[PDB]
Amino acid sequence: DIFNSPQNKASILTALMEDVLIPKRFRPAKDPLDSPQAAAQFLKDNKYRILRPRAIPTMVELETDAALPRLRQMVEDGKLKDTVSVPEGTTAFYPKYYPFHKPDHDEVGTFGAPDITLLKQLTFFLLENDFPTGPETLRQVREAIATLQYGSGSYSGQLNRLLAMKGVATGRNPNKTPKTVGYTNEQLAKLLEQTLPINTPKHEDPDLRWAPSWLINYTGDLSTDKSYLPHVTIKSSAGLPYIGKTKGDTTAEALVLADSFIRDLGRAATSADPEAGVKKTITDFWYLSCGLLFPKGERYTQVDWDKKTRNIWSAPYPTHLLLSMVSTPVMNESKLNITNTQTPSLYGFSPFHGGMDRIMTIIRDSLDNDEDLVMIYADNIYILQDNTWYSIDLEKGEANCTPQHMQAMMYYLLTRGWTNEDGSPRYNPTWATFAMNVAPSMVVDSSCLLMNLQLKTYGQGSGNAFTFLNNHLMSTIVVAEWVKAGKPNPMTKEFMDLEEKTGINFKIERELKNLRETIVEAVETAPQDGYLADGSDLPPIRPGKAVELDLLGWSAIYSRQMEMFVPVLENERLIASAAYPKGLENKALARKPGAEIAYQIVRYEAIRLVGGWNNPLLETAAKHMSLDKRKRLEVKGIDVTGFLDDWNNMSEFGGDLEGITLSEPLTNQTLVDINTPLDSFDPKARPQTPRSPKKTLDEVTTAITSGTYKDPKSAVWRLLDQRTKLRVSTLRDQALALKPASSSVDNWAEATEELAQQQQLLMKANNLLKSSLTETREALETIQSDKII
């Protein structure tokens, strides 16, 4: 007996405890900053502000019908918990927040696992198919698996991120308030009328006059039972004072705290001593300004794992609720962007249903007419000039925000949104006080919690209800300054000089040269074969050239079948998402077997839908995998159609492609359906902005340089601007000045004008002039004497 197949004999030591094609799992390094002592020393060494820790009173159980009288019937019907847990204890506690960082040095598991199954399938399919693009697709997917890692970073990554935020806010280019840049609240509002056009909330929506719990209508009758409050993610964190609880566990508690904060603020504002009362309320509710520093799940670079972890500033549920009551009713009625309105705004943009083709038409018309073009989306700016497409991103956007930026946004929302047709306010002095005087210092330049450490937040908390709005306002200032400077080319020093002028850090992320010629090429190289070409259910052998705009992560591809540009996910994103697919993170659906099962198909269909369809190797492998899974289910008689119809609520690409079904496999018709426009497009037929319709951003900028719009014409708006300059002690007098307009009394307009005349008499008193935002921060950071556990 000779010639037996050799087997690897190893030592007993080896037994007791290389493939180039498959990369080994990434094991994060040991984190030296994983202790409060080490983290605090690191921050102290790096001159990052650590606040004197404030404590929260211990929880006390109260009767729900006593705390929330509006919801007595809900308690009586056994539909709402009979007791609420509120921080009203005699003893206090210091809060601690210890987030989970996965994968970590000790645990490299299922979470953040790369799609090795897909990698193997891509390899097998490449061996059987002569796709010209195939070898590069495989190499890129393998490289993304080898260089990236999906996960929640590390304590070191989070701490280093915080340092970078301090650097943006106070380092090379220190932040500047809009006033410092040269804009009054009214001048900014005139710019925002163009860059962020808004409509008023619905006439049936409640005005900003009530305690949150009053906006809940409960009787028992399902046809009439309604909540006029913003919607919340039930499974998301409650934030302070309920660490380790979800919003679902604490809605009654959040209502109690939100009602109390707004009610107490209101009472204090009109009291005998508004300064002492307002400061006391702010100090008592300090925790409403402190976010939990949550590590964001992303496809981080392995080598930079401990250098950068993006954070989500997890806002206290009551604060989130109160802020959302101001923003959401306005924004829900304001899905106005460049594809439907004459505005640079990209708010509510979707590249699907002809959206990308509308952008391409606007780009082509601008190129043909030798016109410059600008588009704004939060911290993203797009400039078309000199036959070049530029993508400009604010450098760590949130860090550039000052409380004054948010106050200017609140001014814009309350003047252009929360207003009646007659010019009377859709708010009372209590809500004007919260919105203008307190709210901006609760989420901007406030604090965050990591472990037992209460740390300073430099700029706005990323993830707060106003993140997009505040970032959009900052980009509006950068764009307005670019227009003022005579539109300098983004590659020049004249453009880069706008960093110091605005106090806003930014960088050129993309420079797409010879745009006109690139577009011609995209049209000419469009294939005659396959999906959206001859309409067959196959990828093209050789795909066409893409116009790599990276417009909110999208590139443009020309379709011969549809005779239009269609979106495809930017290559780098497509490859990263294929390499590290997110799990069923979406909702609390994770334990649902139907959802978990359907997701496996959803994952591969979504990657095809977003642009994989146009990559022959990726399309071949992903089609095979989804079909194989569907076949297994069909044969086995396991039905997951429900989850496949409502797949949007599970896929990271779900929001983008709403109302399409994955119960049937992806075909050419799926691609046709997602790209089908409801209406034909004429850029000239797009309605103008709701406010200053005939004016352009360029005209408003020119008017501002001439000193126009320093002060609003409306007396109501003048009182709201004066509100930003007057100290908290003046709150009772400011409430009196607003009461006639707020109550819509007979001849309120004349009365408001006379009251503003009276208030103007305070405005000679330099002693009465102090930002309520500074007073809020002082009160939030104050450390009053209390006995801890």
Author numbering: 3 to 19, 27 to 798
Verbatim from the authors:
Members of the family Birnaviridae possess bi-segmented double-stranded RNA (dsRNA) genomes and form virions with non-enveloped single-shelled icosahedral capsids. From sequence analysis it was proposed that the RdRPs of Birnaviridae possess a non-canonical active site where the polymerase sequence motifs are re-ordered C-A-B, motif C containing ADN in place of the conserved GDD catalytic residues. An additional unusual feature of birnavirus RdRPs is their ability to self-guanylylate: auto-catalyzing the covalent addition of a GMP moiety to a serine residue of the polymerase in a template-independent manner to form VP1pG. We have cloned, expressed and solved the structure of the RdRP VP1 from IPNV in both its apo form and bound to a catalytic metal (magnesium).
Crystals of full-length VP1 with the C-terminal hexahistidine tag removed diffracted to 3.8 Å resolution but proved refractory to further optimization. As for ΔC55 VP1 in the large unit cell, electron density for residues 3–19 was present in the active site. Some residual electron density could be observed linking residue 19 to the first residue (E27) of an adjacent polymerase molecule, but it was not sufficiently well-resolved to allow modeling of the intervening residues. Despite being crystallized in the presence of Mn2+ and ATP, no metal ions or nucleotides were observed at the active site. While additional electron density was seen connected to the C-terminus of the molecular replacement search model in three of the four copies of VP1 present in the asymmetric unit only eight additional residues (791–798) could be placed, suggesting that residues 799–845 are not ordered. Surprisingly the C-terminus of the fourth molecule in the asymmetric unit (from residue 687 onwards) is significantly refolded compared to the other IPNV VP1 molecules and IBDV VP1. The strand that runs along the side of the palm domain is shifted ‘upward’ to lie at the outer rim of the active site cleft. Neither the helix that lay between the base of the palm and fingers (residues 706–716), the three-helix bundle (residues 724–781) nor the intervening loop region are evident; instead the polypeptide has flipped up and projects away from the back of the fingers. Models of a VP1 elongation complex based on superposition of the reovirus RdRP elongation complex or of HIV reverse transcriptase in complex with a DNA template require refolding of a small segment of the VP1 C-terminal extension, residues 654–670, in order to accommodate the nascent RNA duplex (not shown). It is possible that the purpose of the C-terminal extension is to rigidify the polymerase during initiation, but that this extension must peel away to allow the growing nucleotide chain to exit the active site. The structure of VP1 where residues 688 onwards are refolded might thus represent an intermediate unfolding step rather than a conformation of biological significance in its own right.
